[PDB]
């Protein structure tokens with residue numbers, strides 16, 4: 001049936017991927033040993049989407065792990081869920097790109113992406129009907145950006161009509177974990193602006209603010225942010241893996257959410273977000289979730305949606321809910337928030353409802369918006385890239401890798417065209 | 427003898443179909459296993475095998491397995507013939523292109539052969555029933571294509587369909603206008619009659635009248651199922667006045683290009699109010715002609731009545747019925763077009779409107795199903811046309827359709843047809 005291939009870029013891709021497959025293992029009741037302990041048929045019904053049937057009846061998650069620094073994947077294998085993946089899914093080189101996009105992409109990704117592509121073809125042959133691919137990676141990282149870029153390009157080259165989406169970590173505005181980030185982000189975004197169907201933008205800073213503020217935390221680590229992001233990533237796919245009303249396929253969502261070919265960029269959101277002990281003062285209703293979702297503070301992308309307008313909005317619900325409540329809330333919200341939505345796009349909302357709530361909660365929801373706040377993000381990134389590019393900082397590495405300046409120039413031009421196109425519709 | 431084939435396309439059609447066939451099974455006392463522990467008008471809707479196992483006559487088509495698989499794992503999996511359930515490996519993605527053109531073309535042939543064999547089993551086959559959502563990709567495209575094909579194949583056979591009408595305010599998708607417009611284009615060029623239903627109006631009706639909790643698609647589908655079952659009940663039992671579908675085609679359609687009867691059902695009341703409520707034919711009709719009780723959000727007072735059909739069930743006396751109709755005619759808030767001496771066609775059936783077990787609707791000894799044509803629906807078509815006009819003016823989402831094999835001139839022509847429809851309604855409205 002409908003099946004998805006989950007490709008995990010090195011580093012955060014693999015880590016997030018680990019937590020992601022943990023979440024999925026919890027969803028379908030799959031034991032880390034590979035055995036199915038689940039009590040429901042719905043779990044095994046469409047399970048073939050993310051899993052394969054072994055002769056030993058152990059469920060192999062469908063994924064391909066790729067990194068240039070084996071240590072991470074070693075840490076993954078040492079993990080409890082590393083046993084689920086077959087040893088063939090682990091594909092890596094012994095030399096990291098060192099946050100160099102050109103190096104990885106042009107040099108160190110080619111061999112590995114060839115091997116990975118072979119494995120992809122295998123996994124693709126294993127599919128009855130392939131819906132598409134999903135890539136967990138990071139903008140600004142050498143391996144993720146370079147190898148992800150190349151791999152996605154080749155994946156589209158082989159599979160042009162298939163669904164291409166990626167969950168990408170965007171550069172934080174007020175902080176940075178690395179330098180040179182604008183270059184890598186720019187190049188990656190460029191090739192990803194042309195080569196994908198859609199992409200999701202999530203910033204760790206915004207996640208820190210959100211989690212700390214709403215969940216009342218103290219010492220949160222990357223695992224928690226990855227847990228949340230993975231909850232979202234699992235959240236969007238519920239309609240495919242479970243029955244409900246207005247079941248939304250990924251490409252249908254892509255069609256509904258994308259008004260124009262070049263602007264696919266989305267800002268995810270999630271509800272309910274509440275701290276322990278404060279939940280007792282919270283009532284779970286569609287209005288609550290919708291109010292949490294449409295709140296600017298809960299946007300996981302770093303920006304303020306108050307500046308811009310929504311071209312398209314998709315809201316997917318989980319658990320048993322009333323259509324009337326949803327409709328009324330969408331209308332009311334769209335009514336009071338008028339002028340925050342495009343005037344030439346009547347009914348900006350896209351609704352889908354899954355009957356199965358996330359484990360531990362009676363109900364939940366996920367928000368996916370499209371707005372020019374991302375144009376603001378691109379303005380920032382463009383500015384930083386310009387500033388760094390002017391004085392030719394760190395350029396010697398990329399030129400060392402044989403990266404021509406005209407590539408950077410063209411990329412910048414494309415970014416300018418992107419933000420321009422965002423300004424064109426507003 | 428007299429028989430009909432019920433087609434179900436899209437999740438809407440399938441679910442509505444499930445509720446519908448359930449209600450049929452209830453009315454005919456048939457169990458999910460096809461066993462039934464005077465009514466041969468059930469053979470009208472059913473066939474029979476060696477063991478006396480009764481099977482429904484229908485074809486379920488969804489390009490994605492989804493709800494049909496849910497039905498295959500459902501209670502009535504023992505009822506429907508496995509061959510009647512046809513599923514593809516992927517959806518139309520709310521894209522008219524795919525369903526009407528790219529995907530469904532590799533499917534529909536099987537469905538046509540299926541319907542053909544089902545039609546070969548028939549003797550006196552009167553017509554068809556097509557359940558689908560209006561603006562939903564699969565339903566829209568596939569029903570357009572299928573209606574074209576069936577229109578060519580079966581000719582004069584009655585073609586009826588129930589289309590879920592996109593609401594003025596609430597919307598489940600952004601691309602609904604495109605699909606709806608293409609749909610009404612290719613569908614108008616073929617379909618004999620189409621019943622429009624607005625979920626928002628159903629919400630209003632149930633919530634305000636039925637006084638229930640904020641509902642889900644279940645009870646809505648049950649209500650629509652009651653309406654459909656009422657019509658078929660007009661056909662499925664011996665009343666004082668029996669009405670063929672051809673008679674609906676005859677009476678409700680003044681012109682070949684205009685068929686859009688609006689359904690309204692009464693009584694709609696809570697189980698509690700039923701005791702304080704006294705249902706008289708006149709009162710039920712009075713309730714029927716109220717604008718708030720319409721299954722569509724279209725306001726009737728912005729137009730005039732061309733054709734009106736009233737189907738009665740259970741205990742009804744035609745005397746007070748015609749008396750009531752006169753009393754209704756005396757009302758000038760309700761106005762009829764000048765060139766129509768009488769827009770009333772009445773029918774009556776002794777079979778009462780049985781209620782679904784676990785149903786929220788009050789049990790009554792009589793009920794009325796109303797079908798009506800007005801130009802306020804043209805106003806509705808106007809607002810839809812406006813939405814489409816804007817969305818198309820900015821060429822939003824068009825690249826999908828185009829890339830999937832559509833054309834700009836196609837949308838243009840559809841728009842032209844819609845304009846023609848508007849002006850037709852306008853001219854007839856005079």
Ligand SMILES: Nc1nc2c(ncn2[C@@H]2O[C@H](COP(=O)(O)OP(=O)(O)OP(=O)(O)O)[C@@H](O)[C@H]2O)c(=O)[nH]1
Pocket residue numbers: 246247252435436437438441442489517518519520521525558559560561562563564565590591597598599625643644646647
């Ligand atoms: N009244 C009613 N309408 C429904 C129901 N289910 C779906 N719909 C209508 O269908 C529209 C959504 O599109 P669908 O008909 O579900 O499309 P689909 O069947 O999934 O087929 P695709 O478009 O290819 O995905 C909504 O706007 C609803 O108006 C239902 O159970 N009852």
Ligand SMILES: Nc1nc2c(ncn2[C@@H]2O[C@H](COP(=O)(O)OP(=O)(O)O)[C@@H](O)[C@H]2O)c(=O)[nH]1
Pocket residue numbers: 010011012015016096097098099100138140141142143144145169176177178204222223225226
């Ligand atoms: N959300 C999330 N982001 C991460 C995680 N680990 C690293 N990152 C991000 O990835 C970036 C580091 O890039 P990296 O993958 O190490 O570059 P590379 O090794 O050359 O491919 C930092 O800016 C982090 O924000 C994680 O566990 N979760």
Ligand SMILES: [Mg+2]
Pocket residue numbers: 436437488490492517564
């Ligand atoms: Mg569908």
